[PDB]
């Protein structure tokens with residue numbers, strides 16, 4: 048639904064995602080360095096928790112009070128089909144279907160990633176992206192379980208919270 052896509056926000060060299068009015072997640076390596084604020088808020092008002100290329104910001108005030116809070120999980124069960132909510136600069140919404148594999152630690156191009164590997168689903172997709180969220184549906188509810196970190200055997204990795 049559109050409220051889910053309204054959570055996907057351009058951030059640094061990629062994207063991030065509003066889990067709730069106060070919680071923003073992204074991939075560490077797209078985060079700007081040497082800034083005094085994020086989204087106009089001083090660093091002194093933001094609780095930053097990051098590890099394994101997963102970054103979480105918790106703001107002191109409601110930044111996106113238009114949003115309900117949704118569930119953030121540490122990866123998903125092996126075999127889950129996730130959608131990676133990729134946005135283009137136009138605002139075009141391009142969900143990418145991925146079959147999720149195992150959670151592991153990996154060194155990718157110098158950075159330790161705590162992530163879950165997956166494979167792009169050729170059969171479920173039409174015949175600057177780091178930070179995009181990996182989501183899947185539980186009932187009519189959406190769950191977020193990672194952020195796009197790496198891709199190359201049509202393989203992807205999302206960083207996950209630990």
Ligand SMILES: *[C@@H](O)[C@@H]1CCC(=O)NCCCCC[C@@H](CCCCC)OC(=O)N[C@@H](CC(C)C)C(=O)N1
Nearest residue numbers: 076155156158175176177196197198199202203204
């Ligand atoms: C967002 O910043 C990118 C998204 C992936 C991407 O752009 N892939 C195209 C370049 C491929 C470079 C090789 C891959 C190998 C990953 C293998 C595991 C599937 O490297 C990355 O994807 N590196 C990654 C940055 C590191 C620091 C995690 C990256 O480009 N992420």
